[PDB]
Amino acid sequence: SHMCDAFVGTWKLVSSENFDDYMKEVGVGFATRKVAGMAKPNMIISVNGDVITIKSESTFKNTEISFILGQEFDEVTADDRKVKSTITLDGGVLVHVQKWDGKSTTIKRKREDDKLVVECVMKGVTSTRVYERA
Ligand SMILES: O=C(O)CCCn1nc(C(F)(F)F)c2c1CCCCC2
């Protein structure tokens, strides 16, 4: 209880850095990278008991995941990968690992001042996405 209080809310993307290169590293093709790179999603995070729900809504795609910390689940990503995901809390950071096709990427979400900072990492390539309260 209260495990993710400071994440809960409605958040809007305000800045992105290096996201094209992250998407390339992931294997996203040209047209999806261009279209997806324009999106300014709203991320809606809620908690009900042990179940955390993260919704992302944008002009590109709407996605939704619900999960229990430490318990693997199937996820269809915004770029249409079919991945196996596990999300844990490590020192106050939500750590989301996605596995598919022998590959792996990690998305970390943390609270920093009034922002929610999302770091997406694949091999040597990081992207930072900054969200503010909507
Ligand atoms: O939460 C975040 O800001 C970023 C992580 C999720 N996310 N959001 C989008 C986009 F561009 F469609 F919005 C994509 C991905 C997965 C990575 C592949 C590109 C599509």
Residues sharing a CB contact under 8 Å with residue 15, sequence separation 6 or more, in sequence order: 128, 129, 130
Which residue from 89, 97, 95 is spatially nearest to 108, judged by alpha carbons?
A: 95
Extended strands (E) in 1-124: 9-17, 42-48, 51-57, 62-67, 73-76, 82-90, 93-100, 103-112, 115-122
With a 6 Å cutoff on the Cβ, whether 36 touches ligand 1 is yes
CA of 100 to the centre of ligand 1 (A): 16
Q: Reply yes or no on domain 5-132 having CATH 2.40.128.20.
A: yes
Residue 9 Ramachandran class (φ > 0 left, ψ -120 to 50 alpha, else beta) = left
Q: Are 9 and 114 in contact (CB under 8 A)?
A: no
* Separation CA 92–CA 89 (nearest Å): 6
Tell me the CA distances in angstroms from 33 to 83, 99, 120, 126, 131, one per residue in order: 18, 20, 15, 16, 20
Q: Would strands 93-100 and 51-57 be described as parallel, antiparallel, or unpaired?
A: unpaired
In the beta sheet, which residues pair with residue 115? Answer: 112, 132
Q: What method did the depositors use to determine the structure?
A: X-ray
- CA dist 58 and 46 (Å) reads 18
Q: What spacing in Å lies between the alpha carbon of 50 and ligand 1's midpoint?
A: 25
Resolution of the deposited coordinates, in angstroms? Answer: 1.1
Ligand 1 center from residue 113 Cα (angstroms): 22
Q: Is 111 annotated as a binding residue?
A: no
Alpha helices in 1-134 (DSSP H): 19-26, 30-38
Q: Any known ligand binding at 129?
A: yes
133 marked ligand binding residue: no
Closest to 110 (Cα-Cα) out of 118, 100, 121: 118
Nearest protein CA to atom 11 of ligand 1, as residue: 36
Nearest CA to ligand 1 atom 9: 78
Q: Residue ranges of the domains in the chain?
A: 5-132
Q: Report the chain's C-alpha Rg in angstroms.
A: 14
Best residue among 40, 77, 132 to mutate for probing ligand 1's pocket (most ligand atoms within 8 Å of CB) is: 77
Cα distance between residue 36 and residue 20, in whole Å: 9
